[PDB]
Amino acid sequence: SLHPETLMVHGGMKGLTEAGVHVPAIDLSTTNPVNDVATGGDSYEWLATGHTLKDGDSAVYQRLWQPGVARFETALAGLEHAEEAVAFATGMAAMTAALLAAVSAGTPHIVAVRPLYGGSDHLLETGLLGTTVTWAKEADIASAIQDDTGLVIVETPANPSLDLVDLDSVVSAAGNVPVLVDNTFCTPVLQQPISHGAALVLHSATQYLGGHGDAMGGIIATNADWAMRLRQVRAITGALLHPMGAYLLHRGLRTLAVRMRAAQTTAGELAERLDAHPAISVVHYPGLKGQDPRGLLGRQMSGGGAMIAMELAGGFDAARSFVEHCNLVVHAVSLGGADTLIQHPASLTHRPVAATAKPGDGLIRLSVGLEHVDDLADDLIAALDAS
Amino acid sequence: SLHPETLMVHGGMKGLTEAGVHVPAIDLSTTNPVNDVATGGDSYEWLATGHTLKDGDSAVYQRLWQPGVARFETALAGLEHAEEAVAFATGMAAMTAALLAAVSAGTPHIVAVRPLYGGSDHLLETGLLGTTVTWAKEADIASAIQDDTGLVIVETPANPSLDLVDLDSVVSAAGNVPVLVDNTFCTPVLQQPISHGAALVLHSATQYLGGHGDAMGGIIATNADWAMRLRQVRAITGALLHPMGAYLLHRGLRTLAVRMRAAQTTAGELAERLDAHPAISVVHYPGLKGQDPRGLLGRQMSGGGAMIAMELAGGFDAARSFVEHCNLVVHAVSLGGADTLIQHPASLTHRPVAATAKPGDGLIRLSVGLEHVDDLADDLIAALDAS
Amino acid sequence: SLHPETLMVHGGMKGLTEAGVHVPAIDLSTTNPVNDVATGGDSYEWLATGHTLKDGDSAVYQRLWQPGVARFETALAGLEHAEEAVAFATGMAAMTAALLAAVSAGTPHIVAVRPLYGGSDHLLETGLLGTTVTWAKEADIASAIQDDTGLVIVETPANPSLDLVDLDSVVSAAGNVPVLVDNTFCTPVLQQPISHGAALVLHSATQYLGGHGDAMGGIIATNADWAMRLRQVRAITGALLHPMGAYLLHRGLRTLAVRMRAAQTTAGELAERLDAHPAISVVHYPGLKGQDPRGLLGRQMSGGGAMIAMELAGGFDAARSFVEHCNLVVHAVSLGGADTLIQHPASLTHRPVAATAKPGDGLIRLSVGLEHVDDLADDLIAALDAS
Amino acid sequence: SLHPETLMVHGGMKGLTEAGVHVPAIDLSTTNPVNDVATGGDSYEWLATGHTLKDGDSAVYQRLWQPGVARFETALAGLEHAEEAVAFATGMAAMTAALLAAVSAGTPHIVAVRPLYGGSDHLLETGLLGTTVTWAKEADIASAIQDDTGLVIVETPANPSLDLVDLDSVVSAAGNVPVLVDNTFCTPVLQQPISHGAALVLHSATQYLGGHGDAMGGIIATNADWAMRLRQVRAITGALLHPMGAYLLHRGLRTLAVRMRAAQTTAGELAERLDAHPAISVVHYPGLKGQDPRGLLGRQMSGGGAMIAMELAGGFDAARSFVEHCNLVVHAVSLGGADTLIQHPASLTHRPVAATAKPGDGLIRLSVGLEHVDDLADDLIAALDAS
Numbered sequence A, B, C, D: 001s002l003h004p005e006t007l008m009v010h011g012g013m014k015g016l017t018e019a020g021v022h023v024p025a026i027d028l029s030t031t032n033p034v035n036d037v038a039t040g041g042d043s044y045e046w047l048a049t050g051h052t053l054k055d056g057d058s059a060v061y062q063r064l065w066q067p068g069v070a071r072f073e074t075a076l077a078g079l080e081h082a083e084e085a086v087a088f089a090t091g092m093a094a095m096t097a098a099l100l101a102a103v104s105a106g107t108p109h110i111v112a113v114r115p116l117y118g119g120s121d122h123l124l125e126t127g128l129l130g131t132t133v134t135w136a137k138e139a140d141i142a143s144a145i146q147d148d149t150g151l152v153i154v155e156t157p158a159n160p161s162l163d164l165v166d167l168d169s170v171v172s173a174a175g176n177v178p179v180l181v182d183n184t185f186c187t188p189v190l191q192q193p194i195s196h197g198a199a200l201v202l203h204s205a206t207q208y209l210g211g212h213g214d215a216m217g218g219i220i221a222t223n224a225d226w227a228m229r230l231r232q233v234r235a236i237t238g239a240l241l242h243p244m245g246a247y248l249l250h251r252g253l254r255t256l257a258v259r260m261r262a263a264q265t266t267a268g269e270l271a272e273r274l275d276a277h278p279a280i281s282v283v284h285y286p287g288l289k290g291q292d293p294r295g296l297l298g299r300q301m302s303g304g305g306a307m308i309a310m311e312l313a314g315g316f317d318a319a320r321s322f323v324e325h326c327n328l329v330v331h332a333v334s335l336g337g338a339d340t341l342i343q344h345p346a347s348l349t350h351r352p353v354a355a356t357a358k359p360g361d362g363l364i365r366l367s368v369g370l371e372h373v374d375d376l377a378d379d380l381i382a383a384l385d386a387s
């Protein structure tokens, strides 16, 4: 019954007002005492087998359950409209757990759609976790699926070029196979993959959910079956989210709508000014005219986002000079933060990607922050004029 | 040239006094800016391929390098007398990385000697990470080794029964295969597996290294080849140790010698009093008479430790009543903390272990803390007399 | 040359990008080593006598200087356009330091204009710190000033009724006496009291500057003379802001403009809906028509704010029932947070105030958060209809 | 019924085991919601008037009550055997509150015995808080007392020269006037001033109670009357201890007996080696022969302590050469940490002290840590031999 702006502030804050406290406490306890051998043992088995902690039951150990992490999990699950959510140390740890869950189930094959984040792409290419990958285009998903396929890894807008994918078509092509959508760039503010029929939704909480570049994290909003499988892997592989990391990511969700709306407004205006510059040939931004032929803005995405990628006319040398002459905009990886960042994907985020699949050498990715539009445009224009 | 007691206080504190600060700072930065595309890209590749951060180089991203974690890593490596060390979110994440490093190298077979911690035992039994295991006795290690073997996993004193293993004999039997010794129970204060020829030394930093039951962690002190392999896995799977977790584990190392020496003294006295009680049939404690036939105390272990396991005369019912009637001693999992804890291993820590390999039903594990010996004995005796 | 929205993100972040880090580190060091007796001693004297730490000098001790606190201090001083700023544990500690500085200078008399926060009002009334106070109206400031006066204390919008004060007129009436302006409610986003000629500007950083209800703090943006006096008191009375408290308050400044602008928009709309309700007789909100006769909105305040006070028609019983029937809006003290709070000032914030000076029994104060306007209005209307 | 070693581990940990948690949680909440206007208002008045929070009552606001601070308060009060305890940001904030409590009661005069820490000394000399002072010798306390006297401030061993004071004689001479004893150097492990009849016992929790040089703090263990007065001052002046500061000082109490016993053993041996060196003329350490004529060791102090001061034969030049040539031992202020520190008191800790009352120019103070005795002696001897 409440709007998403209200649910970002009060999500995962259940029972705190009733207990006479304002924010969730940070419990650093590694162990959690048990009342007796029978209840302690049953709670251990329930949690180790991937189940949610029962109300009025001991967490037993942090690798089995953490209350602060659990609050962050229920907060994001409510925003994505998923049954449950499982949080890990990083976005890669969440990807690792989802791949190990599929391998453990007897479905090691993965049908993935490029572009994807460099690490997600490299982890599937190497097959470190016993996975086999089949790189397929959006239209050729149904054909690429084998009896051995466990998941369909997709991402929209893609990292770095912001390639869009119709989630309704992907779910239709996947059939009985579950679809994993990496909704890091859009966030639950702009896109809700669960509504389109995605089984699991991955987020690199490090970006946008944290929002201040000071909390690493990874989280998958999904149904109870996949949450149980992810928790089974988490309890034995232990890629845990620290109680303070969970606190800051949950804290960041309270300002996610106001931060996304402010950065999106700045980005929509910057993409127009940057397209007009002669040094830039192509500007990739969903909110621009022509960039949305399938009509996914409105239907799937309630906004253009705060990420802008661009192809330089002078190729690699112009792209290199552009990031090196930025002063206010900082040359660094990561996104969704309070400050504006810029980077060459082929040299940093997508460096472990295969040569054939690497992004363009003239391409530059930018994360728009909460600074004034004029000060960011002045700095980016001066950097382009330096070449 | 310095004693281990001095190195626990000043280890990993290099350059802090020279910078005008007392303790290492907690840098929560997820990203780390780069000077240019060339140096940033080269630093990314150097770190992603498992190398140590060069002095005067950007960390690029937290999943590649964290300075607070690095200080903890160098502090423990110096205590174990290893070349380097790699830290993770939990002890299970460190085990996971070591197993994935062996599988990635083309050696998925592991030769492990029981007893081991329930999770370490279950992770090998299930073969979640693409590993095959051959459970062998200490004397039958050489015969159990195949051309496909990547590691020899041992633990001494074993969790929970405190079974001792001659590390010189295990290294001799392994030959060309590297040996991984879990030194969680002994700590670098009491045992140095690197000196016996172990290639890698695992520690659940959650216990003893942290010492206050408020910091989860895992760390492997090893040579440069295995450290590079572990960091390659850590960079892509991301089971990272949070900057505050690293701060508290590093902080805990400063008091590790004084905490271990105090708890060991209390444990040596408790094991004698508990052996004299009629309710207890067997008291497993290395420092006790008859428990050390091979003369490993002095030679391998400088002391008896602060862990005591015991077999109850009345079986499961006496073991159950003993932990349920403890008041000062708390019924909970985990060890090496400031407080004394007690638990039934077959019901909790070793619950995911196979029925044939599970510990005795009358066995009880106890972690001795920093409380007065008389107050702990009074509580444990009253709990035994309650049945 | 930069806009205030840009300066909130990058303020106090000097040298971090150049050092290869994203956010300021949290240095918990209580002590700071010295190079020699001469430089250490001179740095001790320089800091103990209220001076700023020199570049390339030891902080010596945390009670003399803390670097994380110093970054927060320079960030807010730039936002208020003050020379320097001094931070303390709470807003009351900052008030205490300012009153102690005036008493130490030989000017214990204070001219204060009501309404003020309950604690600020009570601390002056009791004269705990050796002060004498003369409660004067805005027009009668010049007459109330004595040769013994050290400060003129004003607050606009006042806590709780939001009474406005013309700062240009107050500065003119004070003359040689410095004016302290508590700018907690307006924040540097909406008011620049230093521009009007205020010597010192006080903020309860706990509210708005922190913004998430999880960091207590107090800070005074002022000239070098008063900053020196405040630091001299801080070094000997030690009401220090903890390094983590400074980190979160500095972190909160990065989203201050987007949080204030979102809550102000919601408040301007709520004040019109609440004025139309029959249960409420008077709604105090500067943005509302008729509430600004002196035209201070535009000239002094660049916005109406996110605080709304109101007088119930049914007196105390209606005011009591209104806060007790709120569900989404929480009955609690404090303001400027991500969530909407409500409280009866005469019973809580202004309870230590003298009976004659206490606010109206039918008056209720409300802090507007970042929730959707419809969900907040629905809850507040239902609470009024419950009576 | 329990020993002090047991009470240091389990003190202030009441109800945690019963709630299924290991360590106390860190609640950063600035505000605490109230059930209704009547209970909220009554809880506000009860806390603002200096009373302890009732069980099952809202804390209302952090400046009135904090639960993590409260657990640290009850933990130390039990160790000192006091009724209650009040914690502040620093040791100077606690001194400030006690002095303001005496001034507020109508007893501004103080009878203080030197030597005292430079800050305590200077705060009394300046009379910043409206406090008159009469510097008296231990034997002349009774004569120095006026009808206006509110407190008798003493410290043993004194900072820096370790001068001992007979607490039984001081209490007898004070009579009706309460005695404040600064027990920072001895800690509740070695001295219990409450047993000798002291009304209030101050500690600079920054030293020894924290023990790792990363948590500033101040605390006074006292009867209910003085605790109420101290809390009345704390609620209005707000020199609060941050929830994380409270957590680390409480955490530090768990290892206080093992840290004190280890550093005391190292110090007793170092004082003997340093006395034998020709460069040092006098070694002030209570345990050494002749340094305790009144027999206070055993009767009042159960140990010599971990602080050593000494007079150099070459005067100031030898004293400055000694601290400047130390490498392992660090030249810095503060004490009771895991590492060994050294400093010239007249130039640093006691620099704001009057020239007549300042310590000797050849005097050097040293805080002994948890490093090996041989490594500390080797470094200190080499530093003396450098001159």
Ligand SMILES: C/C=C(/N=C/c1c(COP(=O)(O)O)cnc(C)c1O)C(=O)O
Binding pocket: A090, A091, A092, A093, A117, A119, A120, A155, A159, A182, A184, A185, A203, A204, A205, A206, A207, A216, A217, A218, A333, A334, A335, A349, B061, B063, B238
């Ligand atoms: C270097 C960081 C960047 N990204 C990461 C990322 C991850 C992986 O998330 P952790 O980094 O493991 O929390 C997953 N999915 C997406 C769409 C991502 O952007 C970056 O692009 O700049």
Ligand SMILES: C/C=C(/N=C/c1c(COP(=O)(O)O)cnc(C)c1O)C(=O)O
Binding pocket: A061, A063, A238, B090, B091, B092, B093, B116, B117, B119, B120, B155, B159, B182, B184, B185, B203, B204, B205, B206, B216, B217, B218, B333, B334, B335, B349
């Ligand atoms: C429940 C925890 C206990 N142990 C853990 C542990 C680990 C694994 O370490 P993390 O628990 O993942 O940090 C590895 N190796 C050993 C010998 C261990 O004791 C326990 O038994 O009490």
Ligand SMILES: C/C=C(/N=C/c1c(COP(=O)(O)O)cnc(C)c1O)C(=O)O
Binding pocket: C090, C091, C092, C093, C117, C119, C120, C155, C159, C182, C184, C185, C203, C204, C205, C206, C216, C217, C218, C333, C334, C335, C349, D061, D063, D238
């Ligand atoms: C209970 C807290 C509230 N405010 C306090 C406050 C302070 C004092 O700020 P510390 O509370 O000392 O940080 C100073 N100045 C103003 C205008 C304030 O509103 C409140 O009213 O809800």
Ligand SMILES: C/C=C(/N=C/c1c(COP(=O)(O)O)cnc(C)c1O)C(=O)O
Binding pocket: C061, C063, C238, D090, D091, D092, D093, D117, D119, D120, D155, D159, D182, D184, D185, D203, D204, D205, D206, D207, D216, D217, D218, D333, D334, D335, D349
């Ligand atoms: C510079 C610091 C030192 N001392 C402090 C101190 C305090 C004052 O407490 P905070 O320092 O404010 O926590 C109170 N009481 C005693 C006996 C102290 O030694 C020091 O001596 O090295």
